[PDB]
Structure 1
């Protein structure tokens, strides 16, 4: 009769019909990833295209049910998902031109090589090579060569291609009732139709800047301390009032500062915690690692793994003649099928990432009862944050004592506490200015407020003001340095890394109160706590059926992202850092340059 009854019928056939195809397509991908043959890839190609051709045909007749005559909110969410025109709005020739442009960027980035001077025969690549230098070299004139050459041969050839990438993808957003491409990516945080929970697309910019204004006092103190320790390594290359050259941060792009731990350890005579030796002495294997991590989730009230998880998953390198891809991943094949692919080793690094992957699986079980189109996290930054907080708890010394890996005769002193936090700070805090600046540069380029003749000029002006990193060699308008990163060249959004960091410390703080934890936030463990698990399970079982604003309120009791819990985690490090820079300068001056 009405238009809602005929819309629910379309959402009743699709759910049962799409699930069948999604299982077969995901079954062919598993076989190739565990058995690499030229015949197994044929099954993936044959099965995958069937699913791809299924969606466009089904979405074609989903546009004939208008959205202005439906009052039931759970139906509008599903209909809006299937009403997305996508890249199908562009013409026949414009779509092809965009498609070949993207494939070119993936090809050039993966096969890029640099040939060293005086040896024109043997050349060096990135995945091995250039990396090794940017992780294990202390020579000033050798790191500079690798930094500049890669951006001179790979980056320069991406300059003309990236210009067309903006203009061909801005018009796609304009036809889709968005004023630019940047607003497309900001639509993942949009909530409409619920009173008291609305979140406009333009409010993401205001909130990100508001939270970042409270991070600078912590960032400057860590920035000044790193600069002082780096003057010892390189005698006459760093100024005490200036910035840090871009080729001395422990990696190629400055994204993470983890490789600087050797030169910036506060107390070098005290070693870190490593339980690899204790595991091999007790004959731990791959099966034991995944058996112990399952017990962690049972204690907090969450369910345990299915029978098919053990019979079907892959937890050890096949060896012999069978080949496979060794990237750790979590699979949701459909129809209640969950597996894990991992080339496990008996180490501490592999013990922690087992909890990270198994945390993903628990999320997938929670919303398996939801409709098919509403089976995901609240937004792009929710799935990763859930897994991260599980690895934080397992890495605590108190947890390791319980599972018998660390002896009860292990005393924790304040010296080792600072060492642990600085290692964490060089990875979490150090990447926040980098993520905020790059996304801001991409956002303002799409709006068009940065002219094509000032792309590089404003790139390094924001670097010196927000990140405080100066270039070693002047870069003119023919360079495309931001395109040298994997995410930028391969069309991936970057703002999910900023929100994931903030979400993961709001979740941790809320869960530690439910467990009645007293003391610094970095020692809190959520094991054997049913209240923490019950609070977390309410968010997990919602899925995409509810606004992320309300889902966040179910755990932390707030409707907006906050940065205060992040500073609480790193508060002890803040006090120690101030006492180090009393006889030193905090901040940087933009007028300095190593080339003048």
Structure 2
């Protein structure tokens, strides 16, 4: 019989209902109040009962033996209930503990290091800036310690129950654990291994940047502060989680005498505003013959941090309201080059939303979570080039010297290469818990051992099992899968490469057309490729989505390693010239307490 008419009717209802849920999520995350929190979970609780009642109905349609796979694809997807398979009482408890962590993160406030009276500094503006600009290791340590104790430790109790409920939910859906459930999204039983193999290929490059960065830092801060052969004291890497290091390029760049693209100052001196930044982002898409931002976006978006004393979630993000043209971004944008990249990242999501809007609700998601994260990043790569920045005047006079090209690749290596192992550990960590591989008594050290093992990083001060630091990372507190970023930083270079080729910007043989300098801005053929891929929205496993883009069907590293190659050959030489130590001994930062008072 035909369940097609059923599915059509059902997706349309699910969209209407998710719209209602989305609005409540938006209100809460825009104005954090007990009331909004209540409505928010209330809606989710209702939708969850509807899904259960829709899961039992599908028992009617024996799709597991159907003809036209597309219907059979929708059923497998719709019946795959997530946390919703959970029984009422548990689901409600999960919503709560989830809310407890989320709100806990966003409400973090710490006292200023030079004024124990202020105590109103939050992560997004204040503390985020201190870690970026300060060069007083003791001050950076202060802020690190203060932030981790509030954002991480204070929520160990909820996190643990979250893990328990997450595991219970997974088994109810026939998954081994929440770990395999997340991996299910990549529809490939060998995905983790593929990721393990690509990382293995790039790791050597990662261990020519690490030692080099540890070199300068120790030269700058001094021996007693940064030891050779030991893991780098995170907090001197310009980022609260040390996931990206470009922020300290001023004390760590190859040629400090040569220019270092820092468009922040020009943006500021030029009167740039968040609105202007979003409009630039918008222009990039249309210039590629891609979709212009709809009217609801400008009316309903929050592109600047509210001026009142209300609490909200300001971790940039993009929203699909599941209607037609109702898409919005919420970002506490600031005028800086990094924020400018972020603006493009989020629009990547928005574009993807519009591109697949016409698809059945179930297919209104990205093909593979990684694809959703890579769109915006592909434009950001173009925007970051000296070529495009000179064209828009945010780089008055610049010369491609040669030993200046290194300041661009290496600068990019502090964001794209350094990130890979960081992103991998975020989920390898949560996987090991989801899978009952770690003892509760070793939860906080299992984390740092992993940060140590893969990133060669360690906390600025000694932590014990008494502390619990994983929640200090937004995504851990908000229950947002992280592997998606690791796939993105990999596949985005594949997208970028091809796009640049489809444009007349990249030629492997011709110089003056290097990969690290193509702009693709204004490219209709690149936009066309993007359109073919994006419009499919999960209607097919990701290899077909990629194939729609450039005819390829495999995830690989035939891009980054072809992007950063000149950088990589420059390091191996420079490191030997300065006799730079490569590799590091195991960290001694995780223990189980010690005091000097009695």
Task: Give me the TM-score of the superposition, normalised by structure 1.
Answer: 0.82
Q: Which residue in 2 is equivalent to 1:231?
A: 218
C-alpha separation in 1, matches of 2:343 and 2:400: 25
C-alpha separation in 1, matches of 2:272 and 2:109: 41
Which of 560, 563, 581 is 2:575 aligned to? 581
User: Is 1:437 matched with 2:432?
Assistant: no
Q: Deviations over 1:380-439 (max 9, x none)?
A: 1112211111122233333345556666x6533223322222222112211221221232
Q: Which residue in 2 is equivalent to 1:184?
A: 181
Q: Which residue in 1 is equivalent to 2:83?
A: 87
Q: Deviations over 1:465-502 (max 9, x none)?
A: 32222455444332322233222233221111100101
C-alpha separation in 1, matches of 2:48 and 2:590: 53
Instruction: Report the secondary structure of 1:479's partner residue.
Output: coil
Instruction: Report the secondary structure of 2:205's partner residue.
Output: helix
Q: Deviations over 1:99-146 (max 9, x none)?
A: 433333234434445679999876575426554543343334443344
Q: Deviations over 1:512-554 (max 9, x none)?
A: 2222423321111223443333322221121111110221223
Which of 482, 492, 502 is 2:470 aligned to? 482
Shift of 1:187: 0.9
1:176-575 maps to which residues of 2 (within 5 A)?
A: 176-190=173-187, 199-200=188-189, 203-237=190-224, 238-273=226-261, 293-304=281-292, 308=295, 312=299, 330-340=318-328, 355-403=344-392, 410-471=398-459, 473-516=461-504, 517-518=506-507, 519-575=513-569
Q: Quick check: 2:55–2:79 contact (8 Å CA) kept in 1?
A: yes
Shift of 1:74: 0.9
Q: Which residue in 2 is equivalent to 1:65?
A: 61
Structure 2 vs 1, CA of residues 430 and 281 (structure 1 numbering), >3 Å: closer, same or farther?
closer
Structure 2 vs 1, CA of residues 218 and 368 (structure 1 numbering), >3 Å: closer, same or farther?
same
Structure 2 vs 1, CA of residues 329 and 444 (structure 1 numbering), >3 Å: closer, same or farther?
closer
Structure 2 vs 1, CA of residues 165 and 328 (structure 1 numbering), >3 Å: closer, same or farther?
closer
Structure 2 vs 1, CA of residues 303 and 129 (structure 1 numbering), >3 Å: closer, same or farther?
closer
Structure 2 vs 1, CA of residues 280 and 501 (structure 1 numbering), >3 Å: closer, same or farther?
closer
Q: Deviations over 1:267-295 (max 9, x none)?
A: 22344446678779988887776666555
Q: Quick check: 1:464–1:590 contact (8 Å CA) kept in 2?
A: no
Query: How many pairs align?
Result: 580
Shift of 1:10: 1.2
Moved more, 455-464 or 486-495: 455-464
Instruction: Report the secondary structure of 1:185's partner residue.
Output: helix
Q: Quick check: 1:241–1:588 contact (8 Å CA) kept in 2?
A: yes
C-alpha separation in 2, matches of 1:247 and 1:508: 32
Q: Quick check: 2:51–2:81 contact (8 Å CA) kept in 1?
A: no
Unaligned runs of 5+ in 2: 508-512, 592-598
C-alpha separation in 1, matches of 2:315 and 2:427: 27
Structure 2 vs 1, CA of residues 164 and 313 (structure 1 numbering), >3 Å: closer, same or farther?
closer
C-alpha separation in 2, matches of 1:469 and 1:316: 34
Q: Quick check: 2:152–2:469 contact (8 Å CA) kept in 1?
A: yes
Structure 2 vs 1, CA of residues 246 and 92 (structure 1 numbering), >3 Å: closer, same or farther?
same
Task: Say what the alpha-carbon RMSD is for the aligned residues.
Answer: 4.2
C-alpha separation in 1, matches of 2:488 and 2:41: 34
Shift of 1:453: 3.3
C-alpha separation in 2, matches of 1:382 and 1:563: 15
Q: Which residue in 1 is equivalent to 2:596?
A: none
C-alpha separation in 1, matches of 2:40 and 2:92: 23
Instruction: Report the secondary structure of 1:534's partner residue.
Output: helix
Unaligned runs of 5+ in 1: 191-198
C-alpha separation in 2, matches of 1:89 and 1:25: 18
Moved more, 270-279 or 373-382: 270-279
Shift of 1:75: 0.6
Structure 2 vs 1, CA of residues 312 and 44 (structure 1 numbering), >3 Å: closer, same or farther?
farther
Moved more, 50-59 or 219-228: 50-59
Structure 2 vs 1, CA of residues 281 and 222 (structure 1 numbering), >3 Å: closer, same or farther?
closer
Q: Which residue in 2 is equivalent to 1:162?
A: 159
Q: Deviations over 1:29-61 (max 9, x none)?
A: 889999999999999999988877765555553
Task: Give me the TM-score of the superposition, normalised by structure 2.
Answer: 0.82
Shift of 1:220: 0.9
Shift of 1:148: 3.9
Shift of 1:559: 2.6
Q: Which residue in 1 is equivalent to 2:510?
A: none
Shift of 1:229: 0.6
Structure 2 vs 1, CA of residues 57 and 496 (structure 1 numbering), >3 Å: closer, same or farther?
same
Q: Quick check: 1:465–1:590 contact (8 Å CA) kept in 2?
A: no
Q: Quick check: 2:141–2:461 contact (8 Å CA) kept in 1?
A: no
Moved more, 397-406 or 204-213: 397-406
Structure 2 vs 1, CA of residues 213 and 320 (structure 1 numbering), >3 Å: closer, same or farther?
closer
Instruction: Report the secondary structure of 2:70's partner residue.
Output: helix
Q: Highest CA radius of gyration, 1 or 2?
A: 1
